[PDB]
Amino acid sequence: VQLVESGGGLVQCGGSLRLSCAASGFTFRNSAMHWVRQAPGKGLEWVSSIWYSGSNTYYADSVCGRFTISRDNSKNTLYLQMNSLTAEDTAVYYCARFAGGWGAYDVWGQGTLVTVSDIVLTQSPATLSLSPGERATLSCRASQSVSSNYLAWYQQKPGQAPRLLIYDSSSRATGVPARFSGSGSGTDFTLTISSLEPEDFAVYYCHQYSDISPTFGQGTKVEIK
Amino acid sequence: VQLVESGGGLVQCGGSLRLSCAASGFTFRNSAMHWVRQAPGKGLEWVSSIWYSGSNTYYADSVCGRFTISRDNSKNTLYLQMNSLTAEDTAVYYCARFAGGWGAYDVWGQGTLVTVSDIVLTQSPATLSLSPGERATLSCRASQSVSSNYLAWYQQKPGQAPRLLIYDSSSRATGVPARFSGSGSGTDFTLTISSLEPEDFAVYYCHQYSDISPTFGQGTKVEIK
C-alpha cells in the first residue's frame, strides 16, 4: 500500500497545475482520498477531500473554487486541479487516506512540491488602554528604511472609513487638531497624541507609500480602560 | 469631493463581482485611483491601482490574475473586476484618492461589503529542548470541546512524510514503541514520550478529525539540548 504524487513544480503568480496521486496496494475505488499540504517552515494544512463517489467534494475555505479534486476509479488515481495559484499556495502536497469509513490518515505519499513566484510595518502596542487627558504614543517599525518619510497615519472608527491624520511623518491633514503629531525617521516612526479626547478612541494604522505597492500596519487599538 | 462604492454583496465560493466607485466633486481625469480592502476584524490591505490612463495598473500578490482594475473617465467611475472569489476575499473594499501626482490617500469612499461562502488546535510548547532519556510532555488545546476518538498525533522528520503515532487520544498505531502515550479529554490532550531516544527528536502535530474539515496543530518541535 503506497501513494505517489506527480505533477507540480514551479509556476507563476496565477498559473495553473494538475496533481496526481497514483494509489497501489489497496482497493482505491471504495476508500476516500484527501490532499494535505505543508508550506515550507510551516505545519500540516488540509486541502481537500473526495469522498468515495465523485460530486461529493469538500475544500478548505482558502482553496475553494480554485482547486478541483477528482478521482479516476479505473486508474486508481486521485487528481487535484490547481488554478489561480498564489505565492501563498506554495507547499509540499501530500495525498492521504484512512481505511474504512472515517478515521485518521494512516497512509501518506512522498509529497510533491509546488512553488509560485515588500516592506513590513510593525505597530506596537497592539492595544493601548488610556483615559482622556493622557498622552497616547504609538510606534511603527519598518523592516527596512523608508525614504524621505513617505509615511502616513490613519484614524478609523467602527463602521466609519479610514481618515488621514498625518502625511510625510510630521505634517497634519486638514481638520486634525493640534494634539496630533508625528515624528521619526528611517525605520521607526511615532504617533503622539498630547491629550486624549472622548472622540480620540479608535484604531490607528501607519501607512508607507514609498514603493508602488504601499503597505499598512496591523493597527493599534486605542481604547478606554 | 466624494466617492461612492457600489456592487458587492454576497457571492458563492468561486463566483465573481465587479465593484464600482462613483466619483464626484473632482475632475476624474487628473488623478489616480486605488482600492484598499479591510477584512472584518483585521487591518487595511492595499489591493490594486490605476495610475492615470488605462494600461498602467498594479496589483497585490494575493490578487494576481484574478482581479482586473479598470476606470472609464467619461462616466466618472472606477471599476474592480473580482473573479475566482475565495473566503479570503470577503472584506469591505474602499476606493481611495490623493491629489496631485502621488501621495497618501486623503479621500476615502464609504466602502462596500463583499462576503464569500472550525476547531483550532493550539500546541504548546513551540520548542522542547531535551536530552535522551528525559520525559517529554506535549499539549494540544482545542478551541472547543472535541470528542475522543477524533484526535491524533503525528511524528514528522525533515524531508519525510507525517507518521501517525496516536489515534483516538490513547490508541497507538502499529509499530509505535510503548514509550509513546496519549491522554486528555474535551479541550486538552497530551502526548507523552517516556524516555527520549535518538530517533525521537522530530516535530509533532496534533490532529482532530471530528468534522469534514479536519484541522492540525501548528506543531511542537523536540530538539536535543
Contact A169, A149 (CB under 8 A): yes
Give the residue among B2, B44, B20, B61 at the shortest CA–CA distance from A209. B44
* R_g of chain A computed on alpha carbons: 25
Which cell numbers in the block locate residue B147? 470528542
For residue B137, list its beta bridge partners.
B192
CA distance to partner chain B, nearest, from residue A91 (Å): 13
- Cα B153 → chain centroid: 23
Contact B90, B114 (CB under 8 A): yes
Asked if A58's CB is within 8 angstroms of B64's CB, the reply is no
**B162 residue type, one letter:** P
User: What is the rounded distance in angstroms from the CA atom of residue A199 to the CA atom of residue A46?
Assistant: 45
A45 neighbourhood in chain B, CB within 8 Å: 216
According to CATH, where is 2.60.40.10 located in chain A?
1-117, 118-225
Taking phi over 0 as left and psi of -120 to 50 as alpha, with beta for the rest, B13 belongs to beta
The CATH architecture annotation of domain B118-225 reads: Sandwich (2.60)
Experimental method: X-ray
A117 close contact with B: CB closer than 8 A? no
B126 close contact with A: CB closer than 8 A? no
- Cα B93 → chain centroid: 18
The CATH architecture annotation of domain B1-117 reads: Sandwich (2.60)
User: What is the rounded distance in angstroms from the CA atom of residue B17 to the CA atom of residue A105?
Assistant: 38
Q: Which of A61, A168, A215 lies nearest to residue B46, judging by beta carbons?
A: A215
A205 neighbourhood in chain B, CB within 8 Å: 43-44
Which cell numbers in the block locate residue A83? 488554478
C-alpha dihedral over A104, A106, A111, A114, to 10 degrees? -10
